[PDB]
């Protein structure tokens, strides 16, 4: 009855890992080495490393789901994998927002993008998504730990205030810490980037329709196929996560088994965006498409 919802999750992770590592690698190799560094291409390089390191980290997730929550790798490897995943996912979202804002500023205000949008300002700005990703990943780095299980299994669950070992207090402390992580998930990693992408791709679509500067519908089509793709991949997981973070007390006892698989299948859909970003930002550009074939 729910065994079916698992195989799709395994394939979605599997397609994401292979397609993501090959495609993003292509983006990093062609854009980073083969092509010159323009503001747009460096933004694509940042997104490419962000969604490449995370896809490279995916095999750890597939194996962890395979062994029923057993994390056999260790402590450092759980710290590094979870730290890399959160830095990357949060970035693979802030950089999509930054690309949307860049496309918005370079259409709504062309004079500014001519005078000030240089590779120097671009590299100064591209640290902001990474610095935000690192500061919001600190709960993982300072609290995530391999925690032993009395059942014969080991888990990567966050451990908070190991100083207080009170069984009762640990659940109460966790509910609070994890609610903070949830609000920050739906007001910084989904609401703020979705708002920026929606406002940017709406304002540029509005201008290119009112101005009528475009001749083909390809600009409108690309804007829709990017904004909708980002919303379709992340809205499921961020939604389930919010219902879970508003039901965490009950989840930390294992009572709500359903969200357990809800978080799993939907998170795979969220990760699918990481592999399809190379498919949707650089390979729909003919300059990159020509450069890749000529690169070999």
């Amino acid at each position: 009855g729910y065994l079916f919802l698992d195989i799709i999750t395994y394939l979605v992770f599997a397609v994401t890992f292979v397609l993501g590592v090959l495609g993003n690698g292509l983006v990093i190799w062609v854009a980073g080495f083969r092509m010159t560094h323009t503001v747009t291409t460096i933004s694509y390089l940042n997104l490419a490393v962000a969604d490449f390191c995370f896809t490279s980290t995916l095999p750890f997730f597939m194996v962890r789901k395979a062994m029923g929550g057993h994390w056999p790798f260790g402590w450092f490897l759980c710290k590094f994998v979870f730290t890399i995943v959160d830095i990357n996912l949060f970035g693979s979202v802030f950089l999509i927002a930054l690309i949307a804002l860049d496309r918005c500023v370079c259409v709504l205000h062309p004079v500014w993008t001519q005078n000030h949008r240089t590779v120097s300002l671009a590299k100064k700005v591209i640290i902001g998504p990474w610095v935000m990703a690192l500061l919001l990943t600190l709960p993982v780095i300072i609290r995530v730990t391999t925690v032993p299980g009395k059942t014969g299994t080991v888990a990567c669950t966050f451990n908070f205030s190991p100083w207080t070992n009170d069984p009762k207090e640990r659940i109460n402390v966790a509910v609070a810490m994890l609610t903070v992580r949830g609000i920050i998930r739906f007001i910084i990693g989904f609401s703020a980037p979705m708002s920026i992408v929606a406002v940017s791709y709406g304002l540029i679509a509005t201008k290119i329709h009112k101005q009528g500067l475009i001749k083909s519908s390809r600009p409108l089509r690309v804007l829709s196929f990017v904004a909708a793709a980002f919303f379709l991949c992340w809205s499921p997981y961020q939604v389930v996560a919010l219902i879970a973070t508003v039901r965490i007390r009950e989840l930390l006892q294992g009572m709500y088994k359903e969200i357990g698989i809800a978080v799993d299948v939907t998170s795979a859909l969220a990760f699918f965006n990481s592999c399809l970003n190379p498919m949707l930002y650089v390979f729909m550009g003919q300059d990159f498409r020509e450069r890749l074939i000529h690169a070999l």
Partner: peptide, 5 residues
């Protein structure tokens, strides 16, 4: 991002 729990 990741729901560790």
């Amino acid at each position: 991002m990741l729901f560790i729990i």
